[PDB]
Amino acid sequence: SMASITQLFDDLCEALLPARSVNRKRAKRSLKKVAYNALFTNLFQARNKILMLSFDLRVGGLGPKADRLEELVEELEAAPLLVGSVLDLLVQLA
Amino acid sequence: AAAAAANLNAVRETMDVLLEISRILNTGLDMETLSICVRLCEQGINPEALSSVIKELRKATEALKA
């Protein structure tokens, strides 16, 4: 049903693979190798954050967006369905 | 019944909105990739680790581009 997280990583590598082939194929293999080894190192040795970001756009001058953004994180959790972790990631990649 | 499909609309609409916030926060993720990461997350992938693995491969991508 849901895809093996192998194939998810495969899809993500391909999802940002740059441009048959050989250099393209040896690249993918190394893209995977950076992906897996990076997961593997990091794992061996919430909304607070996202409000503080909306604050910085406000101090960035970006009023309009800081308005929109806190509307969206209020509107997300005003719904009773399957995401603290995605935000965590999004706020991670800010 | 109707809630089986009404689920698919909520996750679509709601996938659209936090995509939009991903765009706001300037994460780099496009729709396709975003979804991948939603899946990974829901399987148990730690968000810290998952961002970190996104970071480093952007890095190598950029660098491998030369």
- Please provide the DSSP assignment of A64-82 as one string: HHHHHHHHHHHHHHT----
Q: How far apart are CA B35 and CA B29, in angstroms?
A: 9
Residues making up chain B, counted from first to last: 66
Q: Which residues, at least 6 apart from A61, have a Cβ–Cβ distance to it below 8 Å?
A: none
Which residue in the set B14, B20, B52 is minimally distant from A42, CB to CB? B52
Residues 6+ apart with CB under 8 A from A83: A76, B18
Cβ A63 vs Cβ A25: under 8 Å:
no
Å from B15 to nearest chain A CA? 10
Locus of tokens 């109707």:
B2
Please list every residue in chain A whose beta carbon sits closer than 8 Å to the beta carbon of residue B28: 93
Instruction: Please answer whether residues A10 and B34 qualify as being in contact, where contact means their C-beta atoms are separated by less than 8 angstroms.
Output: no
Q: Does A56 touch chain B (CB under 8 A)?
A: no
Residue B3 C-alpha, separation from nearest chain A C-alpha, in angstroms: 12
